[PDB]
DNA sequence: AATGACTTCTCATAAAATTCCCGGGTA
DNA sequence: TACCCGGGAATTTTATGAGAAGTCATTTAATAAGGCCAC
RNA sequence: GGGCCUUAUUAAAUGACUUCUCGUCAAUAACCCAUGACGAAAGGGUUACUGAGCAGAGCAGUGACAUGUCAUUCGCCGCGGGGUGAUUCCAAGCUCCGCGCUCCGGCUAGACAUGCCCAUGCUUUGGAAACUUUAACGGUAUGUAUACCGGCUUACAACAAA
């Protein structure tokens, strides 16, 4: 591994080869030892000369796997990085925040219920209400509602503006008129085209059509571009909203001349544009960067999910939902409308047969219909479980990783493209896997990252020489009070005989009515009453995080070796780190070098 | 005139339980 | 000179919240047609 | 022919509001059972009533329910200004008050009358900065650590070792 050398300013000098100098220097005060990895020197002296050959950075983009390499303009590797992100965390601790936020608010509305009770201001015969977006009621009870904010949440906004633009639900003429727009027919009939379409009348529809296409030869069938188009306007509803307003909805060529294009990404995606450009800033302070390379990633999942299909005989534009009215509509029908354990009940509840929990997909492969009754069976009790597998097996989620990765692409070409103007480059993954079979190169993160610096440059030698460094990412905040919560365990003779007094939602094993039961079958009532009379308790349980503590990704000092922590035990009395496994760590026979930088070097 | 590749997947932690250590009464 | 208990400090082991309903939103990719600008 | 915009269909993801439920935690009462320290403490349930909602606490600040009758008056939207997150910086997300219809949504919600109460918002998400006393890697001698050596530039190139 190369020593990177830093100036006297702190700015990067080019990496030095020559181990026995940098002993000799740290021996002499000529340099300190700013960092034992990646093993980094600060010069204390200014040298005779201070000239620097351009150097490449390049990144293989992942969720969890990041490749880094620099690449010196001749194309010699200066260093070679693999970063494990934490991105898999997020949506999960979001799925959390979710729970507790709704849990809180359920539990305002609980205590405003309670004191209606007790004043009988509680409504009278209200067996829930219908809202204006909606056409089934919520089930609401004993006080009206909260307001339910769902029908604007604006987030898009015209692009040539700042005003805001309209639901496709309400401006189905402007949609429609911008298709009918372009036809080699006469105003007139342009008219009666659109007006035919927007009253619906399906004879009158086929009678203009079949004009139509005797007097102009125009291909208007419900089947064919545009009558295709023109008839799916004519739906009761349209998702979202329009990227103009009604004043330039009227006009195409505006992407010319201006634009703002008033982006977003779900913190999920956010976090990880963010690790894919503070790679580039890490590694920015060790080596003296000029020019940055990166390779385009693009998916098409429905290909993922076909791989021995070539791509012109795949149907993108029709997979299991076309024209089937959505996820829970395609389930009804593709069940006949009945819960499918029992085949008498109507469908109540759309069931995830691998749960949300479990890392159970949303797609239509793991949904079943079922009735509440069934419902309650299928999350209690492992026999009815089991037997709904048998029916339609479920899924995990496929794609979670390589749609996050998907989203960020275009945002981190345009980020990269201003931070370096004239010094940004970009690959597509064949690039990577030409030069690697044409170099003898074997795959992984660090060495597609080298192909990728070398794109850009005209390589002398392609040899890929040193042992690559291992970045780990940890969190910069856990707000949580509550670390976990124990269940109320029940114990005889000191052996647990149940974990609740009845069962949670989830709960397969005993509650003590379940265990009272078996135990009122096997030995009668008398010894069953004397069993749970000598039963002895231990309380759901709340424990609780500690304020201010040190985080995961803290580097740190012990018996003279660089450690980073991996995790807290006991009120922060012993640290754990990594590669070490469960070995306790004391606090107090430890120094902390750095809190935690984010992205962390590891051995 | 097409399309190639690529990527992905189990814990930190508190506090309860268990062990170990020094000071002591006893012989 | 020497050993078995106790109480406090130190260290290790144990355990970890779920399901659904009425609606909405944003991003990326592919496919189709249109269009602007394109030897 | 390729870039970029827009519409339709689809695929794969992950964000917001509202509403239901199992289970928890606290306490009282009746009932079933276990049990007797030195006649009575200590113990487990079941059913009912009541309270709780990071078993809550911070910082903000007046509303929260109910009935009447008028209804698109309102508002999730525009402009302005605040709370919280939230402090080392700052972001996401939620939210409140004024004025308003340019745009977007709409019996959401608002107004007025009467009754009763404390019944408001946000808080389990994401980066970055800061710290510093961070002697690494290879070969040789010996009893794994102290010692000694890996030419010259921070670096390329040339030169020098060989
Ligand atoms: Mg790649
Ligand atoms: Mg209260
Ligand atoms: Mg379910
Ligand atoms: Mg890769
Ligand atoms: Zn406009
Ligand atoms: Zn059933």
Redesign the pocket.
Known sequence: ?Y?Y?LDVDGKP????????????M??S?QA??????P??IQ?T?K???????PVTLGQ????????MAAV?F?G?ELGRFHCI???????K???????????????????????????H??????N????????????????????????????????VC??????????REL?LE??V??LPLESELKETLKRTILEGQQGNINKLFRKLRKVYKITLNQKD??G??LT??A?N???????????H?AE?????TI?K???????????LL??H??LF??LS?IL?VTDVAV???????????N?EM???E???????????GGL?AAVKEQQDGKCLLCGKESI?????IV???????????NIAGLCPKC?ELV??DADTAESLTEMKTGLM???????????????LVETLADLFPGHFHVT???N??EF?EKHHLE?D?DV?AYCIACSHLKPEETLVETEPFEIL??????????????????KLDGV?VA?????????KTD???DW?VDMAKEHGK?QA??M???????????????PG????GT?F?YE?K?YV??????????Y?AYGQE???F?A?KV?????????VFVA
């Open positions: 591994r020593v050398v000098l080019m990496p030095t080869c020559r181990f026995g100098k940098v002993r000799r740290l021996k005060g300190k030892a700013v960092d034992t990895l093993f980094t010069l002296y040298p005779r000369t201070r000239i620097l050959q293989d983009p992942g969720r969890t796997n990041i490749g010196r001749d010699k992100t934490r991105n898999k965390e997020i949506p601790l979001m799925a959390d925040r979710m729970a507790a936020r709704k849990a809180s608010r359920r539990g305002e509305r609980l205590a405003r219920k309670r004191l209606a009770r007790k004043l201001t509680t409504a009278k015969h209200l829930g209400r219908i809202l204006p977006g909606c056409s089934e009621p919520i089930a609401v009870k004993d006080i009206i509602n909260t307001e339910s904010r769902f029908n604007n949440r604006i987030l898009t906004k015209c692009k700042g005003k805001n633009t309209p639901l496709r639900r309400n401006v949609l911008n298709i727009r372009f571009w545009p295709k188009n799916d306007i739906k509803k349209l998702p979202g909203r329009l990227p103009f307003c009604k004043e909805f195409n060529e505006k992407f010319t634009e294009s008033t982006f977003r990404l779900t913190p999920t995606a956010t976090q963010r690790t450009i503070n800033r890490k302070g003296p390779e385009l990633n693009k998916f098409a999942f429905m290909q993922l999910d791989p070539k791509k012109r795949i149907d993108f534009c029709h997979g299991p939902l076309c024209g089937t829970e109540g509840h759309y069931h995830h749960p949300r929990s479990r890392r159970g997909s949303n797609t239509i492969a419902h999350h209690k989620k496929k794609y979670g990783g390589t749609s996050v990765l998907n989203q960020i692409i275009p945002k597509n993954g064949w990577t896997k690697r795959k993160h597609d990412q940890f969190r910069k905040h856990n707000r949580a009070i509550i670390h976990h919560q124990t269940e109320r365990t029940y647990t974990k609740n007094r009845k069962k949670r939602m989830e709960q509650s003590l009515e009272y008398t009453d004397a749970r009379s000598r039963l002895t308790v231990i309380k759901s349980t709340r424990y609780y995080n500690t503590r040190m985080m995961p580097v000092l003279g660089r922590m991996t995790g807290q035990i006991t009120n922060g009395k012993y754990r469960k070995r306790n004391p107090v120094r902390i070098l750095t809190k935690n930088t984010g992205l």
